[PDB]
Design a protein around this ligand. Structure first.
Ligand code: HEM
Ligand code: HEM
Ligand SMILES: [C-]#N
Ligand SMILES: [C-]#N
Ligand code: NA
Lengths: 128, 132
């Protein structure tokens, strides 16, 4: 865990900072509540197995933020391309992610840091 | 609690000044009495689960006034969008919030300070500029 990683002089990741796997689960869960409640976004997920998605998103965010656990889903570009997702939709989704982090008690500067990791992904996600 | 916050050298907030979570509870309950009695406002809440709304409103006001717990509800812009809420409606709601704070015995100056936090929310909440 973090303790073993610190003994190896490995740096503290965002994942570690925000509370690891348990914190990612809480944040992802709240994230999808918000997204599916947003009448601009919910229809994109009409054909989606939400239980599977949330599992993959937990894995995605953990790995993306420096956690030791693997992401086991499909590439971002392949998944999202063709879905008619615009920069407008991406921004709403990013907004919900920030709200989830805020709701979880993550300091705002760390949320900004997470946005800096996620924002460049708009290339693989969007089409507009 | 405030006792721990002060030992950690965290500052006293507006939340603390008005009596914390317990005070916000009471103000929020009275706030919605006032709102639902206002013929100009009540229809907006037809079919609203008031118990749930009040819980979210307590969270919102506590956090906006510098309290220790995050707001966990939906953001102001999003939740009020598509309802055609005007600057007149918003003014009415703000008045009702101030009257509830008045009724709770919050000093005039502290109510004005709270209104300073709340008035900027008009851009998120309203869709229409009419004051009638
Ligand atoms: C903000 C950055 C985003 C990240 C990190 C992200 C991440 C993911 C992940 C990990 C998956 C699962 C991939 C798999 O099935 O293997 C996924 C699928 C999906 N994403 Fe995103 N996504 C993002 C933005 C968006 C946006 C903006 C939309 C549309 C508003 C969207 C819509 C979808 C949909 C509908 C699926 C499931 C497709 C299916 O039913 O299998 N995503 N995304
Ligand atoms: C003082 C500014 C205001 C604040 C701080 C505020 C706060 C809130 C909060 C915390 C929620 C719940 C969000 C959630 O469900 O997560 C909400 C929703 C709502 N607000 Fe406001 N609001 C304000 C102004 C107004 C005005 C002016 C109106 C219209 C007269 C209004 C009508 C509503 C309605 C109809 C809902 C949805 C309730 C439902 O869930 O059915 N609000 N607001
Ligand atoms: C993808 N959410
Ligand atoms: C709005 N309450
Ligand atoms: Na695709």
């Amino acid at each position: 865990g973090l303790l073993s990683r610190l003994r190896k002089r490995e740096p503290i990741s965002i994942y570690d900072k925000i509370g690891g796997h348990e914190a990612i689960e809480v944040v992802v869960e709240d994230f999808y509540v918000r997204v599916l409640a947003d009448d601009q976004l919910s229809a994109f997920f009409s054909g989606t197995n939400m239980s599977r998605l949330k599992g993959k998103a937990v894995e995605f965010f953990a790995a993306a933020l420096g956690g030791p656990e693997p992401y086991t889903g499909a590439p971002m570009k392949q998944v999202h391309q063709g879905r008619g997702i615009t920069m407008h939709h991406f921004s709403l989704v990013a907004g919900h992610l920030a709200d989830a982090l805020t709701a979880a008690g993550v300091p705002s500067e760390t949320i900004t840091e997470i946005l800096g990791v996620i924002a460049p992904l708009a290339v693989d996600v969007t089409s507009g």
